[PDB]
Amino acid sequence: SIDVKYIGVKSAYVSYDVQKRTIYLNITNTLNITNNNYYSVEVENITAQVQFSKTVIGKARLNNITIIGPLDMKQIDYTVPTVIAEEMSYMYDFCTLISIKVHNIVLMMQVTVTTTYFGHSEQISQERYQYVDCG
Amino acid sequence: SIDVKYIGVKSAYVSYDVQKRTIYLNITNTLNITNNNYYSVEVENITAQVQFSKTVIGKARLNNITIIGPLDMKQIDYTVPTVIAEEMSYMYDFCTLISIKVHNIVLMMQVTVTTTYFGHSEQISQERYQYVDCG
Amino acid sequence: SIDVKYIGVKSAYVSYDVQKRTIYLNITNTLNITNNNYYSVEVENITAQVQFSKTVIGKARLNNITIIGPLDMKQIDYTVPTVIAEEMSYMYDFCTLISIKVHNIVLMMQVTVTTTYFGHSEQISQERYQYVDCG
Amino acid sequence: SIDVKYIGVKSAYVSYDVQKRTIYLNITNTLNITNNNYYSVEVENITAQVQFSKTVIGKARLNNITIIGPLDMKQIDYTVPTVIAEEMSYMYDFCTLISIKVHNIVLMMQVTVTTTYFGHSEQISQERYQYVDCG
Amino acid sequence: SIDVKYIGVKSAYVSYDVQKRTIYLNITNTLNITNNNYYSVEVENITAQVQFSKTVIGKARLNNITIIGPLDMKQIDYTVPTVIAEEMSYMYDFCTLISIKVHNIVLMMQVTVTTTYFGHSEQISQERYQYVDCG
């Protein structure tokens, strides 16, 4: 990736910024800009490229073959009991929360068993993340 | 990716910004801009490209073959009981929440068993994310 | 992706912005802009490209073959009982919520068993996301 | 990656910034900029490239073969019981939270059993992250 | 990576910054900038490259072969019981939280059993991270 930029507030090439009650007198600004950008990116010169997969099985006996790919959960138990009992009481609850499984961003590109890959693969994530604001 | 930009507030090439009760006097601004951009991106020069997959089975005996791809959940139990009992009580509840499974963004590109791939693959995610604001 | 931009508020090439009771005096602005953009993107030069898949089975015995693709859920139980019992009580509930499975954005491109792919694949997601605002 | 930049507040080439009630007198600014950028990135010169995978099985006996890919969870138990009992009491709860499994950003590129890969792979993550703000 | 930059507040080539009620008198600024950048990055010159994997099994007997990839969890138990009992009491709780498993950023590139890889692989993470702010 030639350019990746996380810019919180202000991004600019040339900035004249005047703010919060200033006095801006005789000003002469002369700006002469020559800017040129040449991008030669991902250029590929190939005579011959071959992807070849071959399998042959002869006179064989195969019994109980199990192939299990990734990300298997099987047996998961979440037990979260909440019990509130009051006889003669005063209860004030402000900003209370229970969260079990919270997922913001899931990016999954190549999940397989057998992968043959020729090329280019890129993942980019940018965020501002605030979970809980109370008060 | 040639250019990826996360810009919170303001993005500009040339900015004259005057704000919050300033006094802006005699100003002479002369701006002369020569800007040229040439993008040669993803150019491919190929005589011959071959993707070849072949399978042959002869005189074989195959019994109990099981192939299971990725992301298998099987047995998942969520138990979240909530019981509230009050005899003679005062209960004030403000901004209370229960969330079990919350998913914002799920991106899944290549999930398979066998994959043969020639080319280019790109995933880009940008967000501002605030979960809970109370008060 | 040549250009991806997350811009919260203001995006502009040249900006003269005057705001919140300023006094803007004699101003001379002369702007001379030469801007040229040339995009050569995804150009492909191919004599011959071949995608060839062949399978042959001879004199074979196949019994109990099971192929199961991805994303299998099987057995999932969500139990969320809520019981409220009051004899002589005062109950004030403001902004209370229960959510089990909430999904904003699901993007699924290539989910298969066998995939042969020549080309280009791109996924882009941009959002502003606020879940719960109370008060 | 030629350029990666985390910029909290302000990013600019040339900045004239005047802020918080200054007095800006006779100013002469003459700016002459010649800037040129040439990017030759990811250029590949290949006569012949071959990816070849071949398997042959003959006169063999295979019984109880199990292949299990990565990220297997099996048996996971989360027990979080909460019990509150009050006879004659005053309870004030402000900003209380229980979270079991919270995931912001999950990026998974190549998870397989057998992978043959020719090319370029890049993962970039930038964020501002604040979990809980109370008061 | 040619350039990686963590910049907390301000990044600029040439900066004239005037702030907090200064008096800026007769100023003459003459700026003459010649800046040129040439990037030749990731250029590869290859006659022939061969990735070849071959397996042959003959007249063999294979029983109880188990191959288990990485990141296996098996049996994990989280027990966090919380019990609060008050007869005649005053309880004030401000900013109290219980978190079991919290994950901000998980990046997984190449997790496999057998991997043959020709190329370039890069992971870059930049963040500002504050967990809990109370008061």
Ligand SMILES: *[C@@H]1O[C@H](CO)[C@@H](O)[C@H](O)[C@H]1NC(C)=O
């Ligand atoms: C601008 O310069 C002239 C020079 O003749 C001067 O008389 C005038 O007072 C100046 N005004 C300001 C606002 O700087």
Ligand SMILES: *[C@@H]1O[C@H](CO)[C@@H](O)[C@H](O)[C@H]1NC(C)=O
């Ligand atoms: C502006 O820049 C160009 C770039 O070569 C130059 O030829 C020209 O003389 C400059 N003009 C002035 C007034 O400096």
Ligand SMILES: *[C@@H]1O[C@H](CO)[C@@H](O)[C@H](O)[C@H]1NC(C)=O
């Ligand atoms: C590579 O590209 C150049 C053009 O930039 C061309 O002249 C040359 O013949 C190419 N070589 C091959 C056939 O791979």
Ligand SMILES: *[C@@H]1O[C@H](CO)[C@@H](O)[C@H](O)[C@H]1NC(C)=O
């Ligand atoms: C195949 O597996 C099953 C259960 O996994 C088992 O009961 C059976 O005996 C196995 N077959 C042989 C020939 O061992």
Ligand SMILES: *[C@@H]1O[C@H](CO)[C@@H](O)[C@H](O)[C@H]1NC(C)=O
């Ligand atoms: C602008 O400049 C002229 C120069 O003759 C001066 O008389 C005038 O007061 C100036 N006005 C402002 C608003 O700067």
Ligand SMILES: *[C@@H]1O[C@H](CO)[C@@H](O)[C@H](O)[C@H]1NC(C)=O
């Ligand atoms: C404006 O820029 C062009 C770019 O070459 C230049 O030829 C021209 O002389 C400039 N004009 C002035 C008034 O500086």
Ligand SMILES: *[C@@H]1O[C@H](CO)[C@@H](O)[C@H](O)[C@H]1NC(C)=O
């Ligand atoms: C590659 O492209 C160039 C044009 O840029 C062409 O002259 C050359 O013959 C090509 N080579 C081949 C046939 O791969």
Ligand SMILES: *[C@@H]1O[C@H](CO)[C@@H](O)[C@H](O)[C@H]1NC(C)=O
């Ligand atoms: C095939 O599998 C089933 C259950 O998985 C088992 O009952 C059976 O005996 C197996 N067959 C052989 C020949 O082992």
Ligand SMILES: *[C@@H]1O[C@H](CO)[C@@H](O)[C@H](O)[C@H]1NC(C)=O
């Ligand atoms: C503009 O400039 C002229 C110069 O003759 C001056 O007389 C006038 O007061 C100025 N007015 C403003 C609003 O700057």
Ligand SMILES: *[C@@H]1O[C@H](CO)[C@@H](O)[C@H](O)[C@H]1NC(C)=O
């Ligand atoms: C405006 O820019 C063009 C671009 O070449 C230039 O030829 C011309 O002289 C410029 N005009 C002025 C008044 O500077």
Ligand SMILES: *[C@@H]1O[C@H](CO)[C@@H](O)[C@H](O)[C@H]1NC(C)=O
């Ligand atoms: C590639 O494209 C060029 C034109 O840009 C052409 O002259 C050349 O013959 C092409 N090569 C082939 C046939 O792949």
Ligand SMILES: *[C@@H]1O[C@H](CO)[C@@H](O)[C@H](O)[C@H]1NC(C)=O
């Ligand atoms: C095929 O599978 C079934 C159940 O999966 C099993 O009952 C049966 O015995 C199997 N056949 C053989 C020949 O093992």
Ligand SMILES: *[C@@H]1O[C@H](CO)[C@@H](O)[C@H](O)[C@H]1NC(C)=O
């Ligand atoms: C600008 O310079 C002139 C020079 O003749 C001077 O008379 C004037 O007072 C100056 N004004 C400011 C605002 O600096």
Ligand SMILES: *[C@@H]1O[C@H](CO)[C@@H](O)[C@H](O)[C@H]1NC(C)=O
């Ligand atoms: C501006 O920069 C260019 C770059 O070569 C130069 O030729 C020209 O003389 C400069 N102009 C001035 C007024 O210095």
Ligand SMILES: *[C@@H]1O[C@H](CO)[C@@H](O)[C@H](O)[C@H]1NC(C)=O
């Ligand atoms: C490599 O590229 C150059 C052009 O930059 C070309 O002249 C040369 O023939 C190429 N070599 C090969 C065929 O790999």
Ligand SMILES: *[C@@H]1O[C@H](CO)[C@@H](O)[C@H](O)[C@H]1NC(C)=O
């Ligand atoms: C194959 O495995 C099963 C259970 O994993 C077992 O009961 C059986 O006896 C095994 N077969 C042989 C021939 O050992």
